[PDB]
Amino acid sequence: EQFQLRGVLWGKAYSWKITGTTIDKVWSIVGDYVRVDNWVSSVVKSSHVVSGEANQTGCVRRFVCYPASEGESETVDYSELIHMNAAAHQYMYMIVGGNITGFSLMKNYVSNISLSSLPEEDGGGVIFYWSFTAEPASNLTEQKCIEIVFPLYTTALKDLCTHLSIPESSVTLLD
Amino acid sequence: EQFQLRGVLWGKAYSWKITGTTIDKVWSIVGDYVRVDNWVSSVVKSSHVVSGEANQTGCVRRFVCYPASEGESETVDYSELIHMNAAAHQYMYMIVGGNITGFSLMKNYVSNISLSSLPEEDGGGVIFYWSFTAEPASNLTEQKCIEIVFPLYTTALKDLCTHLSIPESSVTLLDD
């Protein structure tokens, strides 16, 4: 009959409907965690595992991003896979280092990806769930985090279509 | 060029499609965080806010569960709301105290609830996303965690239908 208060979190969750594809096809790109360069290829130049075994829980990926603008340097993201369930097409990760533009500003950025199949009889398709949280800190606001994260998710959904060779119209942001 | 290794997590995410209702009817039940007794009524006897403002982030609810099986006693759950975006139909909470059966065994049980609408153009309907994580601990297993959580979520979706006055056939667990 007692309890201990914890800190509150910032963040937001997004869901897209994707037609003209299957959970396996989406996963073949999105599920290769340590080769994110083969997914968000418009932002990410290269990626490889630097700790643990590729795509296994606890592993760390290091990926390199193209310069944010001309003159600026490439930036780096280290992120740990903190939960992986490939059979259930879902995983969870956190940035544990690097100077990746914007994302490296957040405190304990944690992200969740979940894929689901819509019923066969409803025309199939995939529900792509993608959320993040970050801890409140004085150099940011929740609104500023959203302005960092959401545009990237949007780009990644576009880059997904490119790699799937399906039109961008295949993707609809729910709500 | 350095990073900081951390521990891994246990958990699982589930999604259901719910027909025959609207996202705002579902939210009126599911979104009323401190009155979970009006939702999972097969399990929860009573509930109220005990810290902060009702359903505002940071608040804590205390709720009483019926005996889990015959002979046992009522148990109690203290859970804190740690994120809330009502207009976006999504929130996050964590158990911060109590002896609630099964759930209080987990270390740092964190849960996420997210509602979305399917396109009007393609039938409508609500996608109900519900996930949890817990921190691995010597006294438990992830499989045990899933045995604790999933039947509760399952029961909760059935109770939701009761309170919405829609057939339980309205709910379908999505393949993952």
Residue numbers in the entry:
A (entry chain A): 9 to 183
B (entry chain B): 9 to 184
Paper quotes:
Hydroxynitrile lyases (HNLs) catalyze the cleavage of cyanohydrins into the corresponding aldehyde or ketone and hydrogen cyanide123. In addition to enzyme characterization and synthesis of cyanohydrins, we determined the tertiary structure of Davallia tyermannii HNL (DtHNL) and proposed its catalytic mechanism. The enzyme is a dimer and exhibits a Bet v1-like fold. We discovered a protein with hydroxynitrile forming activity unique within the Bet v1 superfamily.
